[PDB]
Point group: D3
Chain length 132, copies 6
Amino acid sequence: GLQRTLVLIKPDAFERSLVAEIMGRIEKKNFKIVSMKFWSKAPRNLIEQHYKEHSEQSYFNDLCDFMVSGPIISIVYEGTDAISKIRRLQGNILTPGTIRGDLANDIGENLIHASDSEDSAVDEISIWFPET
Amino acid sequence: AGLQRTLVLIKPDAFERSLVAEIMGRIEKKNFKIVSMKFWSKAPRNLIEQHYKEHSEQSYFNDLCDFMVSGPIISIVYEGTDAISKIRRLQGNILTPGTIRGDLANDIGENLIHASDSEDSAVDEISIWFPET
Amino acid sequence: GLQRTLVLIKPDAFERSLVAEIMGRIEKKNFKIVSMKFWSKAPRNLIEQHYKEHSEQSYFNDLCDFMVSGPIISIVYEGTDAISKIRRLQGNILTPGTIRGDLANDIGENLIHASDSEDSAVDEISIWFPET
Amino acid sequence: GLQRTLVLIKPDAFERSLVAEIMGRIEKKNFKIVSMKFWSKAPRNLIEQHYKEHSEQSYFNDLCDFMVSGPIISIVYEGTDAISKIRRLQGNILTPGTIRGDLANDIGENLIHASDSEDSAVDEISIWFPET
Amino acid sequence: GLQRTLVLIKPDAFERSLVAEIMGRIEKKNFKIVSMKFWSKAPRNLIEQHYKEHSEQSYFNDLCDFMVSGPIISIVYEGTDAISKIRRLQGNILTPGTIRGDLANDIGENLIHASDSEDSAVDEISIWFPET
Amino acid sequence: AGLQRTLVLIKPDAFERSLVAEIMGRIEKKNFKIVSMKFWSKAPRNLIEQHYKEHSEQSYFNDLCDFMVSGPIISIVYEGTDAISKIRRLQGNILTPGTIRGDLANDIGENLIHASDSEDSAVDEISIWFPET
Ligand SMILES: Nc1nc2c(ncn2[C@@H]2O[C@H](COP(=O)(O)OP(=O)(O)O)[C@@H](O)[C@H]2O)c(=O)[nH]1
Ligand SMILES: Nc1nc2c(ncn2[C@@H]2O[C@H](COP(=O)(O)OP(=O)(O)O)[C@@H](O)[C@H]2O)c(=O)[nH]1
Ligand SMILES: Nc1nc2c(ncn2[C@@H]2O[C@H](COP(=O)(O)OP(=O)(O)O)[C@@H](O)[C@H]2O)c(=O)[nH]1
Ligand SMILES: Nc1nc2c(ncn2[C@@H]2O[C@H](COP(=O)(O)OP(=O)(O)O)[C@@H](O)[C@H]2O)c(=O)[nH]1
Ligand SMILES: Nc1nc2c(ncn2[C@@H]2O[C@H](COP(=O)(O)OP(=O)(O)O)[C@@H](O)[C@H]2O)c(=O)[nH]1
Ligand SMILES: Nc1nc2c(ncn2[C@@H]2O[C@H](COP(=O)(O)OP(=O)(O)O)[C@@H](O)[C@H]2O)c(=O)[nH]1
Ligand SMILES: [Mg+2]
Ligand SMILES: [Mg+2]
Ligand SMILES: [Mg+2]
Ligand SMILES: [Mg+2]
Ligand SMILES: [Mg+2]
Ligand SMILES: [Mg+2]
């Protein structure tokens, strides 16, 4: 069940120097980088598309601002069951053992994004890596 | 907005085993800040008995108190969003990997760390270890 | 009370350099090594004895071929409630915080074996450490 | 023979979340904590006492302002040849393997203070732990 | 003395899953990613330019082959004295505490490249990140 | 081409302090492979005396032998390019940070690890611990 999924390393990760720590956990679980981009500051449009689902939520504008308040890295990861597994690896701020579980403490500043489904992964990859 | 304070004790087994920084580091990495901290080469047994007052009619009480005064302890007040429950989850238990107790401890009693389990316990415990409120 | 349990570090751990990582996680939870052997290649009979409960499954031959494709280490660990605790440490590939959860991504190539019961434990120890 | 030495964890360590990292390196080399205090803000007189040997240097006021710009932890460590060994552990920003070598990149914001001699040691301990 | 320098993460780093480990050491020393590219397979021309100094050495062709045998990451790092410091961080396979010192064991497969001078850094950055 | 073998001993202090995996991990991370390994809950004192034969007329000899039989040891043969000297550098000494002894040990005698210091010592020591050459 080989899959590709999309990961974003959020600006709080740079602010807090957790970038390598985060990528290390994914690497140590045996997933491979297919492609990767560094954005010293991501175009707002890209963030807006990425989080389009949320444009009606009240928090949507704070969320874009944050995503644009420092660098992000966009990564395409590949491996068996990658979408589901990396999602689990990302976890939530309540569950220790996971990325957000060990390292994050905020509902907004939570370090990493990982596609949550087959469809969102295909969509998300096309946003950040349109050259496909 | 969600900001809380909670009390943590580093227990004597953590010193015996050199896990003090390991334990504090897990809490630090989850973005909690130290707000005050005390090193006790031996904690006054009266502080302990109070801390575990809710356990005074248990079989284990006197061994527990004995263990807690058997080596150094560090009391720490931590601050951050939802600190009481988040630091509690981090503490976990010896059955759940990913947590401090889950990864590092293997005893009912020698379990390395105490964290307040609720707002009331936190206010109460912080009072005990940091009376200069 | 104390128990002893048997652990095998599988060939994928050597291949991926996770031997010390895996043994470290067991060491940190305070379990002690009672017995240990290194097999640059484990005799196939031993492997077949070890997985005899599986001798009818279609994956049996492949499992054994894998277990023989590189070195393994067999270890007897001692500590309170060892069998069950090291089992939980082992986990599965869906559970962050565990050896297999953090480090493994395959159903078969999963780094570590831990006895699953007092009976299997006693049995597996005699297989690998018959001298006792 | 045993010595005691004084260590200060500086405000940049708290700012960058390296407190446990730094204390860990000292812990792993087998030194024990005899005394420890946390100062959300250290009294300026203490800092000026501590760096009194520097009171004539042009950086003196700035150093003190830095040392007062965040929390510090003062620690008395005990162990064999503590003063010299923890000094080496501390190192400088040019020496990989040391606290400052791996973690620091500035001449002044350099994470840790360690007493440099038996005299300065005895002195610095009385400054921070006069009750003794 | 703020500087930018060029780092390559070599294919042996991917092969051995040390990518995050390597970037972590640089990150933990407080250097910042200015820009970054992932090459699933770097154009041979780029490698040839990068190592042009060596085109007369006997090992030059083996070296290019290796640099092209798997992915590389090219990174521009920024910080005080970045060229010299990251160079020291890279070290050599003889000196523990450094990247090649802790993790590498071959004169050719040594995990990381870091510009060794002001001129080579400007040259190297122009190769991998010509958009400047 | 440059391939060698060298003998490593994990000493009893490493078990007492739970540093076994930490020590082996540093060697593993530097790309050296285990070629054979033995666990000794107590090493035969005759093996020790031989291992440290070159030290038989020293003040410290009997304490050293006592220490080496005071808890488990693991003997390991490691293989890799230039293994003898590279694993030696990794061992280092209690004065140099970055090394095993530099980071983890603080005693002349309780220094966690032994590594062969030359081709001759390696052949000789490997003979001792792995006589089935
Ligand atoms: N600033 C802010 N961001 C939020 C809030 N709630 C959610 N978000 C962000 O928007 C995303 C919404 O959560 P969700 O759609 O379930 O994505 P997930 O967290 O990756 O599972 C999260 O990743 C958060 O980063 C909020 O209350 N404030
Ligand atoms: N020695 C011993 N100590 C116990 C026992 N049960 C509880 N304790 C001590 O008291 C605590 C019991 O848990 P609880 O009071 O609910 O707080 P918790 O430790 O944070 O879960 C443990 O941390 C132990 O240190 C026991 O059966 N034996
Ligand atoms: N290749 C393969 N191996 C399997 C499969 N099911 C079980 N195994 C092997 O058996 C183990 C998983 O189930 P089991 O033997 O009952 O328990 P466990 O090994 O302790 O998790 C793994 O170690 C696998 O190596 C399968 O469907 N395919
Ligand atoms: N800002 C600044 N601080 C300095 C300078 N020289 C020394 N210091 C301070 O003094 C220390 C370095 O020299 P010194 O005090 O003699 O010994 P050390 O602190 O143990 O390394 C550092 O902790 C600095 O904070 C300088 O040129 N500028
Ligand atoms: N395959 C191979 N590569 C080499 C050899 N010697 C040097 N190299 C490679 O080419 C570079 C030459 O070394 P040098 O110019 O001093 O660069 P440095 O290692 O980064 O300091 C090294 O980075 C090696 O990766 C060799 O004998 N064989
Ligand atoms: N207790 C004690 N042991 C020593 C002393 N000197 C040497 N040794 C032991 O023998 C070794 C001396 O170093 P050497 O024989 O050259 O081998 P090395 O340990 O790898 O440096 C140390 O590892 C110690 O374990 C000493 O003064 N006291
Ligand atoms: Mg989602
Ligand atoms: Mg408790
Ligand atoms: Mg099974
Ligand atoms: Mg000084
Ligand atoms: Mg060079
Ligand atoms: Mg020795």
